[PDB]
Amino acid sequence: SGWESYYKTYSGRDSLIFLVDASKAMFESQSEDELTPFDMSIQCIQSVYISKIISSDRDLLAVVFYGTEKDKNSVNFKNIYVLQELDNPGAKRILELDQFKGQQGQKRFQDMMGHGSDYSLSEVLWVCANLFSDVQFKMSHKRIMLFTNEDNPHGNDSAKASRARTKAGDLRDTGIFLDLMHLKKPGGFDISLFYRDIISIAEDEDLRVHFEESSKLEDLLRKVRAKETRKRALSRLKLKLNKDIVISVGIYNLVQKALKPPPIKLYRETNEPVKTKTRTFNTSTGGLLLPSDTKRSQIYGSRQIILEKEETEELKRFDDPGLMLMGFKPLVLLKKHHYLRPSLFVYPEESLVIGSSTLFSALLIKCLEKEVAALCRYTPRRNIPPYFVALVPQEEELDDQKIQVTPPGFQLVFLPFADDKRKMPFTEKIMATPEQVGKMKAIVEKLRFTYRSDSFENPVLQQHFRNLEALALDLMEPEQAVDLTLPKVEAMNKRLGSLVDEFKELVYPPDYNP
Amino acid sequence: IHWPCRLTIGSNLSIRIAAYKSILQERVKKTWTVVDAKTLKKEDIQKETVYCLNDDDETEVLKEDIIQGFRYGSDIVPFSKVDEEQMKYKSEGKCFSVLGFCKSSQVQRRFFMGNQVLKVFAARDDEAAAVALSSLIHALDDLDMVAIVRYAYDKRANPQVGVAFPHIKHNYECLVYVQLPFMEDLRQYMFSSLKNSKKYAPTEAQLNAVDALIDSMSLAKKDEKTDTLEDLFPTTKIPNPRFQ
């Protein structure tokens, strides 16, 4: 029909830059028994530095000051001082920032950088963009947090305000997210006056006049001590409903033991890392011996059985790695007490195999409807004995805030073998009278509490992190973390006024010494 | 072997208890020894570890000039073993205390941690502990609540927080304890929902086919319509094939 129908028509690392005003307005404090706004900015910066050091040390942080007599930057823009360029956080940077922490630190700031100098925002945004461009690592996020207590710094010039507005728009277009941590101001801080055109995202209720310091300061000051790991698939296995039917799936660990960072060996004199090397040589020949020339041997009552390394690996070979599906088992037969290993999470991939997501979704829907779990043999990697596991469907759940709390997919639970179970000694069944059960029920009800998955903290890891931080920053003493795991028996005793004594009298004979 | 301790609700009530490892991963008890091919003696083969600095001359460093250290974000923080022991988090060993009681539905099995399950009974001889533990188990079962306990094998062992829940059978009853995760262990992963994915929406025929497959591949059967499920493939009663 002519020329009519034949023609138609998670990665990288996070970064952050601290922008701190150097005007005299930031230094004055309202009355005594209060901390000056610049001190609050420094405290927040230090807390963020520590939190980044612990949670994710691969991120990049930078500190830039403006409104100072001195200047320093790769472009020589006046009144701009890049105290710390974008680099991985370290104890040295925190110690350097600690210089300005005290009042003598404030005097050092005044003497070494000055204050009260005029400035233009466009210059600050230019230096920030240059700092972002300088680094070479992939940039998952780019954030600029401006610490200031001024509403409209260019209250007398419109050209400067227009330049700042256009530069803020350009940076927002480039993919830079800007936030403002407004601090104390005697009169009152309002964001709609000048910063309405600069902030990348405006909250639902932010145009009102703000009197108290920014709420985000409290969150920033809240130090977090817990290693953070980005989403990553442990393995990309191949579920096999049949020799021909196959779908690629990804395996993740939603719960993983948090071990303390591994230690290393340092040379005492110079205090630098040393290298570890191991080797094996014949006691007689005294020459380098490779694994090939060695053999594996086992002794059983004056008899030695010897096999090659390849033979030893072959011993455990049963089938290729993956999930070989079998029939479906009712969820009732999955006993709660039959727990062997932490459960894993199985999710669709759709990358290795196209069309697996729809089949996985249908299986999940019908398994939830029928309340069954897919029993399957599992082989995480080559040369590993198979293990029987059960895939129980997981229904997606979300809270009132519409934030995911239980991702959809399959929960893989390892089913113990016959030899995994252990025999137990005979115990005579003794039944308690109903009155004892009632008293203990009263105690249990009196000691009720709501349990959350993250209601407790690992005391060992927290203490280790606090000790390491104290030594790195040369703190006088390490803060003693409160052990939430302790039973806090004082409140327990207070709640159980006389229940314990009554229960003991009812159930414990007079002659008994626990 | 039984592990004896005391379940302590507070500072006044204490029940003598014994715990056994009900479930534990089974591994090979015999290791593999390395021997030379030409001569079948393990004496000839030996392992030597050599430590050297990152220098051209590769100076060897004695075992007595090495200090334990940790990384603090591109900065190295020396931390001696003696200092670690002095500042190590001390704890009272052999402790089994109840922090509180929470609804069973709150604790989900997907959060279970550790590599063992404990079964706790009363002490071997005394009957007072037996009746006390029976009363506690019955109360928990009736109220459908589970205790959040603190477990510590010994002073050296790191303390952990676990869930103890009742287990009542026709001939014996006990408390089943399984470790629970700390806030550090939890992983916050975001996965796109599949229900609302238009491109991942199976049709009615696909759902019917999946349902037919599930029905045809059932590993459980009805025992003469007597309301008693029968397991056709009881994987829990199959010995580990690796040992055989």
Partner: peptide, 24 residues
């Protein structure tokens, strides 16, 4: 996105562990 930690973007902010809090 609401409820997102300001320290590590893309991760869910979590309140400090409150330990045991007995109810009324």
């Amino acid at each position: 996105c609401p409820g997102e930690s300001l320290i590590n973007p893309g991760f869910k902010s979590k309140k400090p562990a409150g330990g045991v809090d007995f109810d009324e």
